[PDB]
Design a protein around this ligand. Structure first.
Ligand code: ZN
Lengths: 73, 278, 49, 286, 70
């Protein structure tokens, strides 16, 4: 399932294309990254806390999880 | 300053290197140079068709290696004969062997230096013995349309080259192109030895080899009974009483002569004991 | 030149060369899809009106 | 262990035009050259070769000339057209040999697993075979001397590979495919009877001249050993093959029964519709 | 030349035989054949085949170049 360069004559697999960009997905990747600090989230600050303990710390420190030694969420 | 019906006294090895150059010359089309001798005006001869490297990039005028030219002719100098080029060959083994759009450029690119430089088109993948697709063309040009394009001086050679005149875009390319005549040389200095190795080789070699015999006949006699009941359905098919039949559907033969020469082989095969022994 | 009749066209220069007297559609595949012959009236018996 | 090769007569026709070179370059009589090819099997094919500018002193016959301008860079050309068609051996004309040949083999055994010398024929009038191979052999003796290297009679043939008869069988312009039983068998009768029994006269040249003037290979190791094979059936008066005569009733049994019944069927074949179409053509003419 | 005619019939055959289908027949030994290439042809057909074997749109053998019913 790859885009490859093939000779018209010998029909030899010549090179791999650097053009496998994948329509819609690579367009689904949000590259702008709009800003939102946590000052906008008013009223769900406990959900900010369990949110960070659930999600943000598995990105940073799995040693926080696996020196205790169970699993990430 | 004058136009004459030409002729190509061909070295059989030319066509040999073309049938190798198209047989092994995988039908991705290729290009070469033709190495003969400009003998005179009303004929020309080829004495050599040499080989080209794997130019698997493209039929082009740029595919010629001039150091392979100079070293090639140099290797003709350290061998006996340093003959002269007369033109160029190429191969069209895939399609119906007609003049490609590089030939319409590299022809006058080559004959700008040469005199004639006749094209060579080949396709050995046409047939095995029946069709001999050798092909050759002389590019006439729009400069020579002042005179009519009629050499004609000896005729019936281009009258019998005129006898086919059937290739689709080439019939169309009557403009800019008139072919050349190619006979085959009286090659009995080699056709003699191709004959003597031909029949000294291809019939039991030393010929004390067949002199298989009778289980072939066993199988052949079961053939030569097993078709005999359906061979004899034809006299039932001849029982039309008055007339009711078109062409007799003659299955009389194909089983006479098989028995004939096959059992000539069985009876001289019966002789070979009293022939070999005494 | 008959309108919508078919011809024999060469591949040479597409020279309009011969004209072919023909029928056009699947006519063969179903045009002649009859039950040919069979038998006579004697095996009917009753629906004669 | 070589039975046969496939011989393309293309570069044999290059032996023909180098046979045209030697008639006009001078003193060099014999056409000597170097054989390209590829070992695939015991069967082999030769598709190309090349003919060497070679000289050979009649005094001290082992004086070779295989130029490496002529060898190496031409092997770069012949490699450049095809990586497959490299060397396999070499050739020269004459039937027997050349006091230099063995050394000329060893110049290129550094190039090939088995550099073969195939002694070739420019003027075929032969009673036996065409060009024939000679493989690297070390048979020596039961003696324990230094190793013999003279390259022994290892059978070959003229094989035919592929189509190639768009030229060839157009250039026949004479010959017919005989449906054997149409004289081709008696052609083989003349060639194996005559061309076999004059080779038998070469064998009385052997077994008379060796009795006369023949030294050490008079009875080296194959004469009595194949006097065994001569002693299949050489016997005196009529050799008395008493098994072979009612065994021959079991033989001629078959041929005369097939000819009898089957040629009576041929009597139907010829006779019956010969009469029908005969008298249709005869009295239906009126 | 009788044998040349006979052997000649099958030189260009049986090795790389393409498959099309019959369509129609105008006249003797020349007919209309559709193809598995997608297009239709009107080609000269042989004297080899029995003439009553070409009722349906049957699977037929043709040459690449020449495209002849064999
Ligand atoms: Zn070409």
């Amino acid at each position: 399932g790859d885009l490859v360069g093939v000779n018209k004559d010998s029909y030899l697999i010549l090179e791999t294309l650097p053009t496998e960009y994948d329509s819609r997905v690579k367009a689904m990747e949000v590259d702008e990254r709009p800003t939102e600090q946590y000052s906008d989230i008013g009223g769900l600050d406990k959900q900010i806390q369990e949110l960070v303990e659930a999600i943000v710390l598995p990105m940073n420190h799995k040693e926080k999880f696996e020196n205790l030694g169970i699993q990430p969420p | 300053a004058v136009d004459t019906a030409e002729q190509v006294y061909i070295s059989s090895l030319a066509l040999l290197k073309m049938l190798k150059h198209g047989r092994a010359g995988v039908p991705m089309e290729v290009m070469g140079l033709m190495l003969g001798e400009f003998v005179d005006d009303y004929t020309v001869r080829v004495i050599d068709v040499f080989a080209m490297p794997q130019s698997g990039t493209g039929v082009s005028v740029e595919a010629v290696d001039p150091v392979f030219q100079a070293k090639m002719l140099d290797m003709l100098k350290q061998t006996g004969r340093p003959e002269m080029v007369v033109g160029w060959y190429h191969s069209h083994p895939g399609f119906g062997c007609w003049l490609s759009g590089v030939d319409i450029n590299t022809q006058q690119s080559f004959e700008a230096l040469s005199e004639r430089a006749v094209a060579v088109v080949v396709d050995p993948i046409q047939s095995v013995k029946g069709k001999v697709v050798i092909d050759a063309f002389r590019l006439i040009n729009a400069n020579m349309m002042v005179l009519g394009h009629e050499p004609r001086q000896t005729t019936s050679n281009l009258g019998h080259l005129n006898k086919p005149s059937i290739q689709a875009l080439i019939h169309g390319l009557n403009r800019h192109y008139y072919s050349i005549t190619i006979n085959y040389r009286k090659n009995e200095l080699e056709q003699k030895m191709l004959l003597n190795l031909h029949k000294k080789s291809w019939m039991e070699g030393l010929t004390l080899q067949d002199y298989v015999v009778k289980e072939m006949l066993e199988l052949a006699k079961n053939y030569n009974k097993a078709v005999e009941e359906e061979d004899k359905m034809t006299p039932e098919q001849l029982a039309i009483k008055n007339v009711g039949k078109q062409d007799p559907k003659r299955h009389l033969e194909e089983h006479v002569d098989v028995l004939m020469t096959s059992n000539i082989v069985q009876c001289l095969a019966a002789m070979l004991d009293t022939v070999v022994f005494k | 030149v008959t309108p919508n009749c078919r011809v024999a066209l060469r591949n040479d220069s597409y020279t309009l060369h011969k004209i072919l007297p023909n029928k056009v559609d699947p006519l063969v595949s179903l045009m002649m899809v009859e039950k040919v012959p069979d038998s006579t009236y004697e095996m009917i018996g009753g629906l004669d009106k | 262990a070589v039975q046969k090769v496939v011989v393309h007569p293309l570069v044999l026709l290059s032996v023909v035009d180098h046979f045209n070179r030697i008639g006009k370059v001078g003193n060099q009589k014999r056409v000597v050259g170097v054989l390209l090819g590829s070992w695939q099997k015991k069967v082999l094919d030769v598709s190309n070769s090349f003919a060497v500018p070679f000289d050979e002193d009649d005094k001290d016959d082992s004086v070779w000339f295989l130029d490496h301008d002529y060898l190496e860079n031409m092997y770069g050309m012949f490699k450049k057209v095809n990586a497959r068609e490299r060397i396999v051996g070499w050739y020269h004309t004459g039937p027997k040999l050349h006091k230099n040949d063995i050394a000329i083999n060893e110049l290129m055994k550094r190039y090939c697993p088995n550099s073969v010398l195939v002694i070739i024929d420019v003027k075929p009038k032969d009673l036996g075979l065409p060009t024939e191979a000679y493989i690297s052999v070390e048979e020596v003796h039961d003696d324990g001397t230094p190793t013999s290297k003279t390259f022994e009679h290892v059978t070959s043939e003229i094989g035919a590979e592929e189509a190639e008869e768009v030229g060839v069988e157009h250039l026949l312009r004479d010959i017919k495919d005989t449906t054997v039983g149409t004289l081709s068998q008696r052609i083989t009768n003349q060639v194996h009877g005559l061309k076999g029994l004059n080779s038998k006269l070469l064998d009385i040249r052997s077994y008379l001249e060796k009795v006369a003037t023949g030294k050490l290979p008079i009875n080296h190791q194959i004469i009595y050993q194949l006097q065994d094979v001569f002693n299949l059936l050489p016997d005196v008066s009529l050799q008395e093959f008493v098994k072979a005569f009612y065994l021959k009733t079991n033989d001629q049994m078959v041929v005369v029964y097939l000819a009898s019944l089957i040629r009576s069927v041929v009597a139907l074949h010829n006779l019956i519709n010969n009469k029908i179409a005969n008298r249709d053509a005869e009295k239906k003419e009126g | 030349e009788f044998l040349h005619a006979q052997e000649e019939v099958k030189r260009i055959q049986s090795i790389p035989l393409v498959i099309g289908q019959f369509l129609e027949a105008v006249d003797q030994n020349t007919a209309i054949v559709g193809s598995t290439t997608g297009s239709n042809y009107y080609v000269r057909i042989l004297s080899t085949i029995d003439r009553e074997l070409l009722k349906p749109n049957a699977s037929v053998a043709l040459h690449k170049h020449s495209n002849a019913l064999v």
